[PDB]
């Protein structure tokens, strides 16, 4: 697919207020793979769109109040059916990695894009999502070369704390489709 220098045309743009300047406007290299579903264990709700914009309703669900204290966002999301939703231009800083670390260098937000796979640590992602994740990845690799040589889980840059994208994530399947 195609890149309007930050934005994915194919997608459904959610204008998240939750971005800012990459420090010294450094360009991204490492892509991190995230997972998420809300409420935790269901798919298709509007609620992800919600969390990612800082508007989600703490009253919509006993699990939504537990996190209604965050302001967080991830560059793009892949829904179970392949649909790509984009909240923030790739060149900008997403509030996704958190307290993370990759190769001596923390605050991994700075230099990374974050892709969310709708799902759970323990349930297989769908064919469409492997096709889509790889699709987006090839694009960013073309814009940002280093990505092909920096790809990881949240669980890698934040062990113990994070386990996403989980043992479900079959890197084999995905890589099989990256350039
Ligand atoms: Zn994550």
UniProtKB/Swiss-Prot annotation:
It catalyses: Hydrolyzes the link between N-acetylmuramoyl residues and L-amino acid residues in certain cell-wall glycopeptides. SMART domains: Ami_2 (SM00644). Changing residue 116 to A: Loss of activity. Zn(2+) is required for amidase activity. Amidase activity is inhibited by metal chelators such as EDTA, dipicolinic acid or 1,10-phenanthroline. One of its GO terms (molecular function) is N-acetylmuramoyl-L-alanine amidase activity. Zn(2+) binds at residues 34, 154, 164. SUPFAM superfamilies: N-acetylmuramoyl-L-alanine amidase-like. Its cofactor is Zn(2+). Its EC number is 3.5.1.28. Changing residue 63 to F: 6-fold decrease in activity. GO terms for cellular component: cytoplasm. The record marks 162 as: Transition state stabilizer. Changing residue 164 to A: Loss of activity. Belongs to the N-acetylmuramoyl-L-alanine amidase 2 family. Involved in cell wall peptidoglycan recycling. Specifically cleaves the amide bond between the lactyl group of N-acetylmuramic acid and the alpha-amino group of the L-alanine in degradation products containing an anhydro N-acetylmuramyl moiety. Is also involved in beta-lactamase induction. This is 1,6-anhydro-N-acetylmuramyl-L-alanine amidase AmpD. The gene is ampD.
């Amino acid at each position: 697919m195609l890149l309007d220098e930050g934005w994915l045309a194919e997608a459904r743009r959610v204008p998240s207020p939750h971005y800012d300047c990459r420090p010294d406007d450094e360009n991204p290299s490492l892509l991190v793979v995230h997972n998420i579903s809300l409420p935790p264990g269901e798919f298709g709700g509007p609620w992800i769109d919600a969390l990612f914009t800082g508007t989600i309703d703490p009253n919509a669900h006993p699990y939504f109040a537990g996190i209604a204290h965050l302001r967080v966002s991830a560059h793009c999301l892949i829904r179970r059916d392949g649909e790509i939703v984009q909240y923030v231009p790739f060149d900008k800083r997403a509030w996704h990695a958190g307290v993370s670390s990759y190769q001596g260098r923390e605050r991994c937000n700075d230099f990374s894009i974050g892709i969310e796979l709708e799902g759970t640590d323990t349930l297989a992602y769908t064919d469409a999502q492997y096709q889509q994740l790889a699709a987006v990845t090839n694009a960013l690799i073309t814009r940002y070369p280093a990505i092909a040589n920096n790809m990881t889980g949240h669980c890698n840059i934040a062990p113990e704390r994070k386990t996403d994208p989980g043992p479900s994530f079959d890197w084999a399947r995905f890589r099989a489709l990256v350039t």
